Amino acid sequence: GPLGSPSKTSNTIRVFLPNKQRTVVNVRNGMSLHDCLMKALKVRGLQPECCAVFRLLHEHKGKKARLDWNTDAASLIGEELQVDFL
């Protein structure tokens, strides 16, 4: 995606689950997209360290895109991610 500061006020990110479910994660200043799942995987029983994702969007391009887990999630809030298992 563009990766920047979209919308007026947003502190979350859209995650897609490989079990037909979808969940968002909250942001706290300085949070990472991969680190924010710890709340996700504990409640649902996932593993973030054993899962990796690519970014999907309704615009479509025809290519696959990898996510930078070392980047700031609160910096690019308004991003879309689909988590697949390794």
Side-chain angles (χ1 to χ4, degrees), residues 8-61:
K8 213 86 178 287
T9 49
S10 53
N11 287 148
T12 11
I13 298 141
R14 303 188 179 192
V15 185
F16 261 77
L17 272 167
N19 206 90
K20 291 81 174 180
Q21 275 78 89
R22 304 157 287 153
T23 188
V24 75
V25 273
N26 317 152
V27 181
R28 277 147 63 153
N29 207 90
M31 277 242 217
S32 316
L33 312 91
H34 202 93
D35 290 79
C36 289
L37 289 336
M38 302 188 281
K39 288 181 96 180
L41 320 331
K42 258 80 180 180
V43 60
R44 286 275 183 176
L46 279 95
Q47 291 184 327
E49 291 182 270
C50 299
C51 300
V53 353
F54 280 59
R55 54 185 181 209
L56 296 53
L57 180 81
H58 208 101
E59 209 79 90
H60 291 101
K61 212 179 180 74

Side-chain angles (χ1 to χ4, degrees), residues 3-6 11 13 27-31 33 71-79:
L3 285 66
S5 55
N11 287 148
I13 298 141
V27 181
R28 277 147 63 153
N29 207 90
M31 277 242 217
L33 312 91
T71 211
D72 285 270
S75 281
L76 27 87
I77 296 169
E79 281 298 290

